[PDB]
Amino acid sequence: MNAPPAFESFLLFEGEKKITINKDTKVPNACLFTINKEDHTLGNIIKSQLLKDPQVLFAGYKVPHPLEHKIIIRVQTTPDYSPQEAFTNAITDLISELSLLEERFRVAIKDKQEGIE
Amino acid sequence: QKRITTPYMTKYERARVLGTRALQIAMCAPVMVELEGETDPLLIAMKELKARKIPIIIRRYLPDGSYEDWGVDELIISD
Amino acid sequence: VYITNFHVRMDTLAHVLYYPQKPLVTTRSMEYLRFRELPAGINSIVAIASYTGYNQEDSVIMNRSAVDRGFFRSVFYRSYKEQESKKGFDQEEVFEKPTRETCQGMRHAIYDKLDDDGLIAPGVRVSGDDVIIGKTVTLPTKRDCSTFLRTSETGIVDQVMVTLNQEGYKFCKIRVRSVRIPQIGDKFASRHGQKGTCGIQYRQEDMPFTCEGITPDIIINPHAIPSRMTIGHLIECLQGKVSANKGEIGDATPFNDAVNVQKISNLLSDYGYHLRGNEVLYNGFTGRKITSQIFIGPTYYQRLKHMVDDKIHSRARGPIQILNRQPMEGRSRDGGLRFGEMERDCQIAHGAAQFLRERLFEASDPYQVHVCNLCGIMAIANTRTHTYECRGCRNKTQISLVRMPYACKLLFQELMSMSIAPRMMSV
Amino acid sequence: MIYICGECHTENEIKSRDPIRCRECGYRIMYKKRTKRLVVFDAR
Amino acid sequence: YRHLALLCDTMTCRGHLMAITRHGVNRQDTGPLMKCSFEETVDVLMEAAAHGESDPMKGVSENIMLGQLAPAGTGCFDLLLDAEKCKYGMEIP
Amino acid sequence: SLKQRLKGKEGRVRGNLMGKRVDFSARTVITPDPNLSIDQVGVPRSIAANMTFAEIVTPFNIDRLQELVRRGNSQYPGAKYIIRDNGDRIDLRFHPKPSDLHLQTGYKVERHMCDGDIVIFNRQPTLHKMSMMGHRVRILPWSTFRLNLSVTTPYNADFDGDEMNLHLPQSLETRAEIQELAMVPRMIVTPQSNRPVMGIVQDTLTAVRKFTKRDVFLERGEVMNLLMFLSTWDGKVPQPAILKPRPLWTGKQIFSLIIPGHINCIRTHSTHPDDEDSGPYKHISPGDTKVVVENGELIMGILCKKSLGTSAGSLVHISYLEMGHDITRLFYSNIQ
Amino acid sequence: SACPLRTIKRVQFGVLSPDELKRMSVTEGGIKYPETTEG
Amino acid sequence: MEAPPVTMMPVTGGTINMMEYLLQGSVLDHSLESLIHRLRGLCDNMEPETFLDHEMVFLLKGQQASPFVLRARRSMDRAGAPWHLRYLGQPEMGDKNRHALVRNCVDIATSENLTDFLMEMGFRMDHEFVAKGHLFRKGIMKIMVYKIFRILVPGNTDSTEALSLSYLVELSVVAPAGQDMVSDDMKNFAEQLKPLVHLEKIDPKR
Amino acid sequence: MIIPVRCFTCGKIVGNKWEAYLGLLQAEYTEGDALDALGLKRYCCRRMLLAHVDLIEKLLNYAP
Amino acid sequence: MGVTCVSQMPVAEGKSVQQTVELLTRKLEMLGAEKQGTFCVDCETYHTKLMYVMHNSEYPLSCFALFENGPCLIADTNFDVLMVKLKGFFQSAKASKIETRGTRYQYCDFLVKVGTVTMGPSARGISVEVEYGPCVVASDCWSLLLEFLQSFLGSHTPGAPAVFGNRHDAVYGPADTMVQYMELFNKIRKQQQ
Amino acid sequence: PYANQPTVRITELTDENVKFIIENTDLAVANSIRRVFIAEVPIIAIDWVQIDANSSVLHDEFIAHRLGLIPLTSDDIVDKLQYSRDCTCEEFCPECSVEFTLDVRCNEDQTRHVTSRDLISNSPRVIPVTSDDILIVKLRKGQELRLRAYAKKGFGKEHAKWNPTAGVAFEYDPDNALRHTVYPKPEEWPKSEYSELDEDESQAPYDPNGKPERFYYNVESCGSLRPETIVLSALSGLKKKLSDLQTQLSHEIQSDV
Amino acid sequence: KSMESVMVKYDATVRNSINQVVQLRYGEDGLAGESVEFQNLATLKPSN
Ligand SMILES: [Mg+2]
Ligand SMILES: [Zn+2]
Ligand SMILES: [Zn+2]
Ligand SMILES: [Zn+2]
Ligand SMILES: [Zn+2]
């Protein structure tokens, strides 16, 4: 019997920082953001946007064990671009998209619900 | 004297020594090479072996009864 | 379900299941053996595919969401009986709440659940360090001999019967109900010879999904079927799908002649699936279509009784038998594993003496005995006056200390009663 | 405390050191009654 | 072949083919504690006391019995310290 | 009787001296854990909290051990007993106020086990040396011994209610030996057949035959997600084999990244023409058999069990005899 | 305590002297009363 | 058996605890002058402090039988000095060789509104004493010589009666708890005052 | 034992359909007809009803 | 002790929590203000009555324990260690901890600090504190803080605080700033929505 | 180097399903929002059954599982009910949970089906959705079940009791135009509902340089919320996790020092 | 039990417990079987 709380998957602990930028000594302009207590919901979404940016040379997410919640994302970028800048920009760009869909859905339901017909 | 034993350390004398040196460091023994961000007695001592500097001499008793006594520095690190 | 009077029967070790279901594919002759009355498993949307890897070597992946809507939930009843004994001429094992006021040996625990009669009531939640039945024997003040549960019972007691035994004494039966949700490790097995423990469980969202939303509750590995050739599990996978969409129990009598693989398949084709069972799935974590079309379908799964909780054993500084000083067993299954000769010999081969010395001596029986040097016989060694004397040799200056296994000291002491006199000569 | 009878199913309250025989009918198998404490389960 | 020769040389070593099933090598040149390893433990020892046969205590199975580091690998060498080498010690502790 | 007590099987002669019931050990079911290195085991939390190494308190660690004792018993990163200098042991369940305990140099804390330890993992029908090999723990939430698939072949298990035992070396002298003479990384080439005992097994072979085939081409999104799973990468994407029409990398190229250092090996894939070697097209291979690995880059050919598995001359064996032990372990984990 | 630790190197087996046994016994010149205790 | 709760990551971050090594002895008033002159000679050359202070001990009567004891000290003599609040742990003395009393100690300077905060929190004032005497120091070691005075009347410091003609002398070191041999240095210093006054570790019990 | 409140796969509430399924079957509807009429179309939402052994029916025959 | 005012400014529109701070801080930088380090205010709570312990980074060693209307004790950091030691005896509460972390901007003897009371892991709200170190007198330095706030804060400028309370010649205290922070924190914890 | 522009297009609505079609978006943005429709939209459901008398033939933790998976009407009060940790209500308590009570004693001869109708709520708005009725337990003469339970608010990653939707169904590229899946033999595979191919053609021709776009959806609400709100509440929620990470990233980029 | 204690003693004479020489040099070649791999001799088979 080893059944742990299933809310811990997203619940941050007292001694747990959510994002910990660990710069890579081996490669210049490379940073490892290690969001803890997230998963592949936010890992595929963040990596998807970093990739669209042309300046981003490499970008990806590995959830190191399925039974331990963490993501590790690395954004190595051209010299002028900063990995921290690439991370800060995408969260905003996705937020615009999400805000756009939300606004657009509301536009859509009202017509259909009231019956565009 | 006449060392007849092989110059290289044996697979098993690199184990008892790495372990013995380690009980010394953990017990507060002086260290013999720089240790940086390292607090683990085996890592501190596996490092010394890399440099040939551990303070121990190995009595390889021969089958007949005579203790040839090679020293850490002379023995060639096999790893 | 074992028999339908589970509520009054009270046998040791009996496990019911929350939702037993009749199989979608049924042999015609099952009805004869009361199986649509006492089924032993649940039809699972199983999907023979390789996913994250945790499904290799007879391992099934499983849906955390479905084992949460009830799939395979079970209760593990275990009955415990204590009989009042009047064997003593004056010794009576009466039934009472032992109280620190009158019984000398009240042990360290919570004796506050036992009610007045002595029996924990139905409905409580027994835990470690709780005393379920309390009895106070009377010595010629009143040593309390009470009953303690072992470890991890932690099951709300369901019934406490108090009634006369065949011997004519007064006895009680307590059934301590415990719920058992499927976890990582529990054996589950199909009806075609394939048995497999779970390797990870994953939630509905992060699992492969059909294009109408049907996420598989079990993902058995593809590699297991070949070498063993159970090509009947895959036929019942097809027929169950045909039966589910046509709504009828599908018969699979050993020889029906109306079931070649092809005839069952053509029926499945009308409903709209690949004639041969494959369906198009999409990776759950990324969403991208898994290239190869996974074979999915409904197949009966039986949940074997064996569970990890019964198997798990662990030990460390555990209770020791005083007579031979080698580990024994108390609560918690603290009797450890055994280093028998076979595994006492790989260690010599690896050449590892110190592990062997540690596992054999330090771990099981570490003793130091003070031995006289001139004669190898053992030596009185007062600790408080710090004197060490070998009476019979009149030596107080030469008493060495030698570490020996306790198991061996007793061989040395026992041999001496027989008069052989080993000298543990140190020189 | 309050034991429950098996046949006539009367709850015959019995103090300690008493015979566990029920009145009216002689069903000598008697089951203890639910705790008056409260235990709280999570639906989980 | 290494493994093949040793089984086929240890067996044919003292000069007579030796059965090596528990019965074949049951007769052996061993200290009483080693020959107390096989069911005659009570009997061999009583004979041993009368005949005063010291057990040389030099066997892997012999030492493990008395909890002494055995003469196996990791066991055949005693280690001694260096008095001169400790000078380089970068005493820090 | 005394003669009866020291008798035969079960007597102080066998039952109590040669084989005894050792402590600091645990047994449980083994389920698959691919995301573990070949030298990791995942002890269940209860077993890890039910066993303990002993850490001599020292100036360097006195800081952490203060918290472990304060938090002892209550939480998994806690200490249970603090054996003292004269040998007494302040069991911490009953010390009334664990917070106030005073640790000193020379005193040893029984820290509950934790990631990074060494344990000798053994199967019960022990026979070959590969039966008792050492693993580094990595404590995980569920109650199962989590093992990598590659090490199952030497253990000879398959995870179907199989049960394996975990014995914890308990002193720094023994940890050194388990670490240096029997760690799964150092026992890949057995002396019985001079062959690697453990080879890429179940799914990972059916995948390697297909990742490494002539028609496989992975696009940019896939290469980066895949290369983040390599722990030997120098961080540089390679140049895609097909460039201008679109940038599509070839499977062989991204398998030449897992391959360690430089190795030269030439072998035959499981499907091999019985005549191609002699005739024309010998070195252009119409069917892509004839694996050639030159300099550490598969230059041609599909990989089979003989090329990647447990046979003499296997790609795994070339590495052990040239490149090393730890590098070979890393390469196996990355391939999986 | 003070007595030094050391390694058994040879074990010698002999029937023990009737006299040595007498001297080593803590019991005074032979167990006498059969009953373990009365007070 | 059981899932001990998992717990966080911060292990190194935090504070080491402060052990107080204490040796306590008494001097009769007639010989006080000889001891004062003697301590001045052995100790560092600093003019004597001549401190006067009022200390009230607060105990918390919670469900657990042992009441938490926090000692609050106000310096009446030194104006504009903050109240000091200290917690003293159970004796950790073990080795006979140490010949010292070891207790866990936390020292916290507090604002004047300390009495009200403690009473609202629920701590209850129990016993109050006024201590007057001289303080001298050698290295880390601090020697305090003081004459405890009983306080009568519910609240005030105007009138005090002497608890004893004699004065307690306490040698105290607030060590960081790193390494040891702190007790050895203390034993040596205590030995010098031993002919003038026998400073020994006296157990608080009876 | 009792119809499970929600299908194990999707989670549709199927628990509320047993009384009619038994009943619609009673009128004459075929197993195909009842499942479709109540609203279950996915293969999972059907297997709970097509295959449930009512058991509380027969443990209610034991007198309390 | 220099007169201080703290208020919460709503993000407004669809501006994300962080987006609004970024903009407000840039507006402060557009006052000629120069950054003078970073400030962290971490507070923990107890359900005992109710205890609050808060510590501004501006004060390096002090820990403030406030008992609602009851007195505030300004104590050394060893106070937190005493609190942890008592912990088994003490009450703990359930994840009520509240922290505001933001940049410090200095504009000619006025220090302005804008931060996001991030509750636990999720940000919600915004706290602005303007302090005047030269102004030892308080309750009538309100004209100053008000004019400066109308300069940058504009709308949502606070009409004083009650920590000034009754008109008095009483000097402003570090305790008063902590009481303002406690009221602001109670409001974020309960504003909801 | 910036955000795409995504459009939506409801194609059918019903009280229990909304088939939107989404367009001009990344495969990931879709899979991510599909996962938030399943495991992050909040709902209110039972979580503290305390049983006072159960003479039913089932145990008293099968009259828990059963109450828990009942679907209660979250309505708009999930917006105004804080989580137990957020509420700081020291576990459950009014305003941090909704109280549900039941009382059935079967004294008449016929079996008395107990059903969701008998779960009664102190808050009028949250009442079991069926308001036919899930059967909690059939009862015989003389047996009683009385229970007190409180319903805390819930995500779905914690347990499937708080899962708003049943079959969330997704699909892009109905004809395998980008040949993501290589039909072993294209002929026998039945056509997708959203097909545009002519009947004769087996599958459409390879169009290589086209990333995936045109994600279909069919959220089917179990009943706790109306199906549209499950879509909108997912999208708000994803924003919060995204908009929460930025705060921490910033409160951490500055203090890299 | 029969091959209980043959060891490669320090001068390479594989010897049993009594110190008797069972094999003069281990395996007749002195090479331990882990680093040895199969090679084609190349001169025995070819024609004169
Ligand atoms: Mg097996
Ligand atoms: Zn003698
Ligand atoms: Zn009756
Ligand atoms: Zn369904
Ligand atoms: Zn509330």
3-state secondary structure chain H: CCCCCCCCCCCCCCCCCEEEEEEEEEECHHHHHHHHHHHHHHCCCCCCCCCEEEEEEEEECCCCCCCEEEEEEECCCCCCCCEEEEEECCCCCCCCCCCCEEEEEEEEEECCCHHHHHHHHCCEEEEEEEEEEEEEEECCEEEEEEEEEEECCCCCCCCEEECCCCEEEEEEEEECCCCCCHHHHHHHHHHHHCCCCCCECCCCCC
3-class SS string, C235-254: HHHHHHHHHHHHCCCEECCC
For residues F84-99, b (16+ Cβ closer than 10 Å) or e, as one string? Answer: beeeeebebeebeebb
Place of tokens 């109050």: H128
Distance from C-alpha of C156 to C-alpha of C178, rounded to nearest angstrom: 7
Ligand 1 ion: residues within 5 Å (CB): F 158, 160, 162
As for how many domains chain I has, the answer is 1
Assign residue K139 the CATH number of its domain.
Answer: 2.170.120.12
| DSSP label at residue A12 | P
L31 vs L12: CA distance, rounded Å: 11
- F25-32 vs F145-147, strand pairing mode: parallel
Q: Catalytic residue numbers of C?
A: 58
Which residues are registered as beta bridge partners of L7?
L15
Q: Name the residue facing K47 among D34, D38, D43 (closest C-beta).
A: D43
Integer-rounded Cα radius of gyration of chain D? 14
The residue out of K160, K189, K204 marking a domain boundary is K160
Would you call K137 helix, strand, or coil by DSSP? Answer: coil
Residue C90, CB-side half-sphere exposure with 13 Å CA sphere: 5
C413 in contact with F at a CB cutoff of 8 Å?
no
Question: For F265, phi and psi rounded to 5 degrees?
Answer: -145, 140
J-contacting residues in H 77-116 (Cβ below 8 Å)? 85, 87, 106-111, 113-114, 116
C-alpha C20/C-alpha C29 separation (Å) is 19
Name the closest ligand to CA F124: 1
- Selection from A37, I8, K125, H49 nearest residue C18 by Cα: I8
- CATH number, domain of K181, equals 3.30.1360.10
Task: Give yes or no: residues K72 and K121 share one domain.
Answer: yes
All residues of chain B having their beta carbon less than 8 Å from the beta carbon of residue F106 are 27-28
CA distance C95 to C85: 10
How far apart (Å, rounded) are the C-alpha atoms in residues J159 and J181?
A: 16
Distance CA G9, CA G20 (A): 23
Number of domains in chain H: 1
Which ligand is located closest to the Cα atom of residue K99? 5
- State which H helix or E strand residue A99 sits in: helix A83-114
Q: Report the relative pairing of strands F163-167 and F118-123 from DSSP bridges.
A: antiparallel
Which two structure tokens, joined as six digits, stand for C36? 């649509």
> What are C57's two structure tokens?
């070597």
Which token pair is J150? Answer: 């109308």
Integer Cα distance of E55 and H166 in angstroms? 72
Contact criterion met (CB below 8 Å) for F269 and F303? yes
> The sheet that has C14-17: what strands, in order across it?
C14-17, C74-77, C179-180
- List, as one string, the DSSP characters of J74-137: EE-THHHHHHHHHTTTS---SS--EEEEEEEEESSSEEEEEEEEEETTEE---EEEEEESS--S
User: Helices I31-38 and I18-27, interaxial angle, to 10°?
Assistant: 140
Query: What is residue G11's three-state secondary structure?
Result: strand
Element (H, E) at B60: strand B57-61
Instruction: Residue F331: name the closest of F267, F238, F262 by CA.
Output: F262
Instruction: Work out the burial of residue H174: count CB atoms within 10 Å of its CB; fewer than 13 is exposed, 13-18 middle, 19 or more buried.
Output: middle
**Considering K160, K189, K205, which residue would you say is the last residue of a domain?**
K160
Contact A51, A59 (CB under 8 A): yes
The residue type at C91 = Q
Residues spanned by the domain of I63: 1-64
Question: Same structural domain for residues K180 and K78?
Answer: no
Q: Where are the alpha helices (DSSP H) in I12-53?
A: 18-27, 31-38, 43-50
Q: How many CA atoms lie within 13 A of K245 on its CB side?
A: 30
CB contact under 8 A, C354 and B19: yes
Is residue K131 within 8 A of residue K73, CB to CB? The reply is yes
Which residues, in sequence order, are CB contacts of A92 under 8 Å at separation 6+?
J16, J19, K246
Give dist(CA H186, CA H25) in Å, integer: 13
What is the domain-level CATH number for residue A35? 3.30.1360.10
Convert G15-34 to b/e letters by CB count within 10 Å (16 or more is b): ebeeeeeeebeeeeeeeeee
d(CA J11, CA C263) in angstroms, rounded, equals 67
Compute the count of residue pairs across chains B and E with CB atoms less than 8 Å apart: 64
Do the Cβ atoms of C367 and C403 come closer than 8 Å? yes
Chain E touched by B28 (CB under 8 Å):
yes
CA distance F135 to F178: 9
Cα C171 to the center of its chain, rounded Å: 28
Three-state SS sequence of F178-238: HHHHCEHHHCCECCCCCCECCCCCHHHHHHHHHHCCCCCEECHHHHHHHHCCCCCCCCCCC
Q: Which two tokens stand for residue K55?
A: 């003479």
* Rounded Cα–Cα distance for residues J49 and J51 (Å): 7
* CB distance K253 to A88 below 8 Å: yes
The CA angle H168-H170-H171, to the nearest 5 degrees, is 160
Measured CA to CA, the distance from residue F229 to residue F249 in angstroms comes to 17
Breaks in chain I (C to N over 2.5 Å), named by the residue before each, are none
* Data resolution in angstroms: 4.1
CB F283 within 8 Å of CB F275: no
Q: Domain range for residue K135?
A: 43-160
K143 and K178 belong to one structural domain: no
d(CA C6, CA J96): 48
Helix F172-181 vs helix B41-50: angle between axes, to the nearest 10 degrees? Answer: 50
- Dihedral sign, Cα of residue K193, residue K196, residue K199, residue K200: negative
Q: Which of residues 328-367 of C touch F (CB under 8 A)?
A: 328, 332, 335-344, 346-347, 349-352, 354-355, 358-360, 362-365
Tell me the backbone φ, ψ of residue H152, rounded to 5 degrees: -115, 170
Q: Are residues K8 and K98 in the same domain?
A: no
Whole-angstrom CA distances from D20 to C79, C85, C138, D17 are 21, 16, 22, 9
Angle at C194 between CA C190 and CA C196, to 5 degrees: 90
Looking at the 3D structure of chain A, how many domains does it have? 1
Which ligand gives the minimal distance to the CA of D6? 3
Q: Is residue H3 one of the residues assigned to a domain?
A: no
CATH number at residue H36: 2.40.320.10
Known binding residue D13? Answer is no
Domain assignment present for residue H26? The answer is yes
Residue numbers of the domain that contains A72 = 1-115
DSSP C108: S
Distance between the two ends of chain D, CA-based, in angstroms? 33
Q: How far is the CA of K87 from the centre of ligand 5 (A)?
A: 7
Lookup: tokens for E34: 């080693």
Select from K25, F99, F45 the least CA-distant residue to A1. F45
Given an 8 Å threshold on Cβ–Cβ distance, is J14 in contact with A99?
Answer: yes
Q: Angle at which helices A83-114 and K227-253 pack, to 10 degrees? A: 160
Annotated binding site of C for Zn(2+): 372, 375, 390, 393, 395
Tell me which long-range contacts C330-333 makes (C-beta under 8 A, separation of at least 24): C331/C128, C331/C148, C331/C150, C331/C151, C332/C150, C332/C151, C332/F50, C332/H1, C333/C150, C333/C151
* Residues whose CB falls within 8 Å of the CB of residue C349, separated by 6 or more in sequence, listed in order: F129
DSSP-derived 3-state class of residue F19? coil
Name the structure determination technique: cryo-EM
Can you state the angle between helices C233-246 and C261-271, rounded to 10 degrees? 40
Q: Is residue H67 domain-resident?
A: yes
Alpha carbon I16 to its chain's center: 8
Distance CA F331, CA F231 (A): 8
What does residue A93 show for φ and ψ, rounded to 5 degrees? -65, -40
What phi, psi does F44 have (nearest 5°)?
-65, 155
Nearest to F20 by CA among D8, J96, C326: C326
Q: Which residues of F touch B22 (CB under 8 A)?
A: 172-173, 176
Task: Supply K194's token pair.
Answer: 């959203």
Tokens of C426: 């140190």
Q: Is residue H110 part of a domain?
A: yes
Homologous superfamily, domain D1-44: RNA polymerase ii, chain L (2.20.28.30)
Using CA atoms, how far residue J179 sits from J62, J117, J119, J129, in Å, is 15, 16, 19, 13
In a domain, H142, yes or no: yes
**Ramachandran category for residue B28: left, alpha or beta (phi over 0 → left; psi -120 to 50 → alpha):** left
CB < 8 Å to C125, chain D: 39
Tokens of F160: 């179907």
Cα–Cα distances in Å, from C169 out to C121, D20, F251, I56, L42?
Answer: 21, 11, 78, 37, 91
State the amino acid at position F217 in one-letter form: F
Rounded Cα distance between H106 and H88, Å, is: 7
**H168 lies in which domain range?**
18-192
DSSP letter string, F28-77: EEEEE-TTS-TTEEE-BHHHHHT-B--EE--TTTHHHHHHHHHTTTTSSS
CA distance F239 to F331: 21
Chains in contact with chain H (at least 3 beta-carbon pairs closer than 8 A): A, C, F, J
User: Would you call K168 and C7 a contact, using CB atoms and an 8 Å cutoff?
Assistant: no
Q: Which amino acid is at C111?
A: Y
How far is residue E19's CA from residue L1's CA, in Å, rounded to a whole number?
A: 12
Identify which of K47, K60, K69 has the shortest CB distance to residue D42.
K47
Structure tokens at A82: 């900063």
Which residues in chain I have Cβ-Cβ distances shorter than 8 Å to C16? 1
Residue C385 sits in a domain whose CATH number is 3.90.1800.10
CB pairs under 8 A between C and K: 86
F16 DSSP assignment: I
